[PDB]
Design a protein around this nucleic acid. Structure first.
Length: 856
DNA sequence: CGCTTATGACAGCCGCG
DNA sequence: GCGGCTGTCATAAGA
């Protein structure tokens, strides 16, 4: 067993560490670590240490971490750089584990848990923990068990014990259907009072103290709630036992006009699964509730139940407990699929950081680079403060709103990381500047070649080509590592246990590598990264902005020569690292007529791209490279999509309403020829969570009908949809939104100045519902359905909004399902955005429409 | 907690016999 | 009575 750390904390002058020893047992140790920092010295000083600029450095070994930290402030007062890794935990980590870390996840306690708190009033604020915790389910990855803590008697009810037998039975049989996979893994524990429950849980927590602590929202609700409850009841020093080092800090987050507080538990790494998912999932969702996600990921959600959750414990304690358990299990089932915790461990051990830092691109890269330079006696720059100045970013072409029959799209691979390597952008690489011509001049090889000596970016920056930059070297290394591991995955498929084993469990390294790669430019633009430099960040994006436009010229010119046309605009759209070309003239040179079926032309274009364009492109970028005199040429484009209408149909190809707003009928993607064509829709309301369900549906149909079938097909559907609108379920045709800053406009239960339309709706609901505690209340920052109300309604206003995902209290319903203004609803959510589609694609959604309402 | 480039729904203020 | 606009909110799409 090669040792490896579990958690590291610096608690003034001493480092507290939890680690797995050479025998796989968990041990903990206190170390009075002595760090070393560095200062520039004269050349007379003989040293093995140099900064990234080659300047000699003296190594200063401190008595304790306090001394070190003192010297830094004292060094800041003087005016001289204080070189070295200032986050000692990392340094200490790098010293105690200088070698590749191999971890046995098996020996790492990973706890996943959830809490239940019956509350008669509103949501039980974790900062105050006013109500009893009547249920806790805590799964421990080591024992592979679900430990359940049931509160039998509470100010809110005295209930019977929970039943496994029943829990396992079908819903038909009155059971909870707790999966059989876990049924024999549940360990049940009923308590007579909360104090017993809490104190028993706390001792359990000491025996099976978590290393990694996750669950769904455990960081904003469960952990603070447990901490505060135990604290309010017993002493504060009892709550602290929740920390293996008995130290905890109250951290206050104030993001997005809010202000919440979490509890830092020294000696534990919290990875709230809802955050891991938001990060490493890369799939923006209209909701992040455990149910929605669970459904999306596993095809089933949280246990279902009747009545208000706050009434569930009395009414159905049996389900209540089972619901608690199923919630813990749902999370595990997602991780059993996405392996995010596992992905977090790989990363943390690859960079040698606290696993929690997997949430910070900066901390991660700083650590990766820090160890890379240590290994070669180099000293990292001191972190510097930097005014936050916004620099120009990605380039985006204004498209001519229109229909586009045939379209091929191309992508640049890892543009930004490529740009760093190709130009060699890094702090200790800046070699100077050059008079800057206007960007377009560069995009057209008209401006004077910036240099004969240095690598250049259009923003006037010049870099050395001889030496190797720290940043570029570091990504390249990762790029290589990615190709290494995904090189094993290639042959790791030729007793398939000695072929598949790591073939997939190993490949996931390919993943993290990719994650570092795509997060480097992010760090570089962050003023808190010790390698940030405004000039460089700007050099990276400006070069990219030149890239896309220079290649647009090249692709334009080529197709024009090839097609015997001149001045014709082929590149119809460009977005940061990709272009979309119109292939009409290329389809014509052959004549749509000469094609067997659709797959025929989809094949023609594929070849044409791979055979005639790709090389003109690589030719073009190579020229650009000689122009900027770059270190090397990493500017590689790929044919992405091939789109067009089904051969023989009257469907337009696709269309563009504006920037980031378009739709295509794609038949091929990077090579994969789909069986049926797929709609690629970007920015249209069909892709918006605020668009009423039924409507995003009919809008998607409308788009499809437009692309694949003709205009006639579209009009038929439209007519039908109006004709049938009033017959749709109201939950389906009601728009949705988020209720933020309700009271900010709540003036006596009425709308103040600038009151947003939906917030106003909320208030109308509020007033028609004031006096009832038997009516689902409109919480803050939540989500609300919104419906327009016909003129002269009893709610006294144009609209109303109630809590989403739910029906509407029979108090106001019927009256709502009577005054809702279908007309206004249809127009606002369906007809107008469609009209935006049609006007752009040059189509009508209603026969005969004076072609003139398109002028002025 | 760990972002520029952009579009669309509303609100309200502005000349305008 | 409303186009042209500046401004608050919402939600994207890829990092």
């Amino acid at each position: 067993m090669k040792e490896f750390y579990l958690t590291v904390e610096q608690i003034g002058d001493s480092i507290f560490e939890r680690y797995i020893d050479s025998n796989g047992r968990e041990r903990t140790r206190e170390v009075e670590y002595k760090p070393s920092l560095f200062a520039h010295c004269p050349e007379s000083q003989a040293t093995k240490y140099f900064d990234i600029y080659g300047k000699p450095c003296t190594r200063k070994l401190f008595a304790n971490m306090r001394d070190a930290s003192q010297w830094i402030k004292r060094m800041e007062d003087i005016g001289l750089e204080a070189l070295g890794m200032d986050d000692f935990k990392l340094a200490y980590l790098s010293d105690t584990y200088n070698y590749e870390i191999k971890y046995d996840h098996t020996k790492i306690r990973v706890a996943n848990f959830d809490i239940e708190v019956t509350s008669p009033d509103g949501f039980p604020e974790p900062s105050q923990a006013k109500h009893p915790i009547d249920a806790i389910t805590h799964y421990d990855s080591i024992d592979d068990r679900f430990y359940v803590f049931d509160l039998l008697n509470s100010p809110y009810g005295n209930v019977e014990e929970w039943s496994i037998e029943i829990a396992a039975k079908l819903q038909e049989q009155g059971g909870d259907e707790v999966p059989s996979e876990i049924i024999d893994k549940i360990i049940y524990m009923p308590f007579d009072n909360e104090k017993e429950l809490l104190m028993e849980y706390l001792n359990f927590w000491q025996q099976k103290t978590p290393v990694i602590l996750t669950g769904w929202n455990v960081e904003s609700f469960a952990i603070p709630y447990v901490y505060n409850r135990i604290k309010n009841i017993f002493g504060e020093s009892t709550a602290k036992r929740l920390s293996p080092h008995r130290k905890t800090r109250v951290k206050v987050i104030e993001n997005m006009y809010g202000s919440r507080e979490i509890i830092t538990l020294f000696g534990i790494s919290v990875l709230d699964y809802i955050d891991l998912y938001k990060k490493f999932s890369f799939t923006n969702q209209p909701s992040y509730s455990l149910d929605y996600i669970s459904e999306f990921e596993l095809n089933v959600g949280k246990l279902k139940y009747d009545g208000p959750i706050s009434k569930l414990r009395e009414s159905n304690h049996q389900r209540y407990i089972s619901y608690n358990i199923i919630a813990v299990y749902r999370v595990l089932q997602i991780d059993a699929k996405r392996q995010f915790i596992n992905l977090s461990l790989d990363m943390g051990y690859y960079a040698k950081i606290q696993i929690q830092s997997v949430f910070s691109p900066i901390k991660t890269w700083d650590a990766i680079i820090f160890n890379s330079l240590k290994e070669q006696n180099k000293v990292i720059p001191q972190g510097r403060s930097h005014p936050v100045q916004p620099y120009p970013g990605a380039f985006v072409k204004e498209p001519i709103p229109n229909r586009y029959k045939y379209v091929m799209s191309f992508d640049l691979t890892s543009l930004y990381p490529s740009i760093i390597r190709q130009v060699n952008i890094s702090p200790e690489t800046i070699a100077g500047t050059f008079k800057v011509a206007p960007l377009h001049d560069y995009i057209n090889a008209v401006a004077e070649r910036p240099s004969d000596v240095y690598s250049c970016s259009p923003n006037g920056m010049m870099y050395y080509k001889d030496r190797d930059g720290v940043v570029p070297t570091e990504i390249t290394k990762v790029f290589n590592q990615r190709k290494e591991h995904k090189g094993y995955m290639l042959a790791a498929q030729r007793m398939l246990f000695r072929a598949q084993r790591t073939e997939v469990a190993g490949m996931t390294a390919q993943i993290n590598r990719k994650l570092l790669i795509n997060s480097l430019y992010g760090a570089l633009g962050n003023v808190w990264f010790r390698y940030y430099d405004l000039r460089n960040a700007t050099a990276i994006t400006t070069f990219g902005q030149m890239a896309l436009q220079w290649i647009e010229r090249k692709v334009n010119e080529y197709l024009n020569e090839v097609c015997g046309t001149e001045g014709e605009a082929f590149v119809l759209y460009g977005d940061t690292d990709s272009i979309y070309v119109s292939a009409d003239k290329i389809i014509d040179k052959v004549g749509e007529s000469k094609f067997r079926d659709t797959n025929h032309w989809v094949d023609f274009l594929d070849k044409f791209a791979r055979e005639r364009m790709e090389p003109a492109i690589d030719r073009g970028f190579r020229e650009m490279c000689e122009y900027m005199n770059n270190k090397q040429h990493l500017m590689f484009m790929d044919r992405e999509a091939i789109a067009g209408p089904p051969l023989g149909s009257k469907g337009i190809g696709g269309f563009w309403t504006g920037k980031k707003r378009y739709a295509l009928n794609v038949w091929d993607m990077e090579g994969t020829r789909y069986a049926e064509p797929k709609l690629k829709i970007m920015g249209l309301e069909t892709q918006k969570s605020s668009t009423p369900k039924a409507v995003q549906k009919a809008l998607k149909e409308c788009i499809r009908r437009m692309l694949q079938e003709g205009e006639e097909s579209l009009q038929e559907y439209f007519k039908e949809f109006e004709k049938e609108f009033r017959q749709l379920n109201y939950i389906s045709i009601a728009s949705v939104s988020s209720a933020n800053n309700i009271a900010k406009y709540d003036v006596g239960g009425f709308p103040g100045p600038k009151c947003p339309f939906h917030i106003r709706g909320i208030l109308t609901y509020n007033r028609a519902i004031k006096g009832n505690i038997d009516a689902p209340q409109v919480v803050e920052g939540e989500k609300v359905y919104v419906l327009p109300l016909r003129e002269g309604n009893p709610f006294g206003d144009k609209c109303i909004a109630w809590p989403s995902g739910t029906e509407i209290t029979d108090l106001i319903k019927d009256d709502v399902l009577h005054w809702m203004d279908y007309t206004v609803l249809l127009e606002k959510t369906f007809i107008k955005p469609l009209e935006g589609f049609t006007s752009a694609a040059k189509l009508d959604y209603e026969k005969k429409a004076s072609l003139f309402d398109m002028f002025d």
